[PDB]
């Protein structure tokens, strides 16, 4: 579990939150000396909660998946709501007693994109913007609600995914500024680059499949090796998305404590 107070949010504090955040969830292995999540972790530990405090000294709880680190749902006051097609398993571990409401929307950006009729490029961002997120959820506004939590995903879930996103979000501690196409392409590419990062181990620093993303400047560039700025101290925890071997459903599901056969 991790806690972040917006009322006392600060650039240095934002850094501590992301470092503690990557340390909060387990680690399947170490890639380039950095944390990472296997295909799936323990369900009891898969769901972690974040205690966030609005600049109004109000406190809410956010539940996210340890692997991709995306908010499945969140709890406000005594009511917690989640999307569909995946988050419902939340009924099992997340909220236990508080009210429960799942919006007809699925835990997908396209579903929220249609309801909000907006794009991340047109959504405001910045520490203070987070106040709008925590603040809006307390005043759950059908239209903003979707855009409110989305800001939280970009400021909390995405911030932990990359230190680069954390830097741009941490730079704003009072004003509000809309994101940039750099995070958009970078967000989708991160997944392809992250799995390739594990591959970078046997490529000496090259990717078998080159990666095309967008530099924070606002232009599109091609990255094919660790020499790129993204692989530098910009990548902390990575998504292993490793489970193809899980096809045999044995190296997994057959872990059978039998290992350590002795006794």
From Swiss-Prot:
Glycosylation sites: 51
Entry annotated with the keyword GTP-binding: no
Catalytic residues identified in the record: 70, 109, 158, 161
Gene3D superfamilies found in the cross-reference section: Ricin (A subunit), domain 1 (3.40.420.10), Ricin (A Subunit), domain 2 (4.10.470.10)
Catalytic activity annotation: Endohydrolysis of the N-glycosidic bond at one specific adenosine on the 28S rRNA
GO molecular function: rRNA N-glycosylase activity; toxin activity
Keywords attached to this entry: Antiviral protein, Glycoprotein, Hydrolase, Plant defense, Protein synthesis inhibitor, Signal, Toxin
Cross-referenced InterPro entries: Ribosome-inact_prot_sf, Ribosome_inactivat_1/2, Ribosome_inactivat_prot, Ribosome_inactivat_prot_CS, Ribosome_inactivat_prot_sub1, Ribosome_inactivat_prot_sub2
Protein modification: Bound to a branched hexasaccharide.
Gene Ontology biological process terms from the UniProt entry: defense response; negative regulation of translation; regulation of defense response to virus
Entry EC number(s): 3.2.2.22
Tagged with keyword Metal-binding: no
Superkingdom assignment: Eukaryota
Protein's job: Irreversibly relaxes supercoiled DNA and catalyzes double-stranded breakage. Also acts as a ribosome inactivating protein.
Note: Possesses anti-HIV and antitumoral activities. Inhibits HIV-1 integrase. Manganese or zinc required for enhancing substrate binding rather than catalysis.
Family that this chain belongs to: Belongs to the ribosome-inactivating protein family. Type 1 RIP subfamily.
Protein name (Swiss-Prot/TrEMBL): Ribosome-inactivating protein beta-momorcharin
């Amino acid at each position: 579990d991790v806690n972040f107070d917006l009322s006392t949010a600060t650039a240095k504090t934002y850094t501590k939150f992301i470092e503690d955040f990557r340390a909060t969830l387990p680690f399947s292995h170490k890639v380039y000396d950095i944390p990472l999540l296997y295909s799936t972790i323990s369900d009891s530990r898969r769901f972690i909660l974040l205690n966030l405090t609005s600049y109004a000294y109000e406190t809410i709880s956010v539940a996210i998946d340890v692997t991709n680190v995306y908010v499945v749902a969140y709890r406000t006051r005594d009511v917690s709501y989640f999307f569909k097609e995946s988050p419902p398993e939340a009924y099992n571990i997340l909220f236990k007693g508080t009210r429960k409401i799942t919006l007809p929307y699925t835990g997908n950006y396209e579903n929220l994109q249609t309801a909000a009729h907006k794009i991340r490029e047109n959504i405001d961002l910045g520490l203070p913007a987070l106040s709008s997120a925590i603040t809006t959820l307390f005043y759950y506004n059908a239209q903003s609600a979707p855009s409110a939590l989305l800001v939280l995903i970009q400021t909390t879930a995405e911030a932990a995914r990359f230190k680069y996103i954390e830097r741009h979000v941490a730079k704003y501690v009072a004003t509000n500024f809309k994101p940039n196409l750099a995070i958009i392409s970078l967000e989708n590419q991160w997944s392809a680059l992250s799995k390739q990062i594990f591959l970078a181990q046997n490529q000496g620093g090259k990717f078998r499949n080159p990666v095309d993303l967008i530099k924070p400047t606002g232009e599109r560039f091609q990255v094919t090796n660790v020499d790129s700025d993204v692989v530098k101290g910009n990548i902390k925890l990575l998504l292993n998305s490793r489970a193809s071997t899980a096809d045999e459903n044995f190296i997994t599901t057959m872990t059978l404590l039998g290992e350590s056969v002795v006794n």
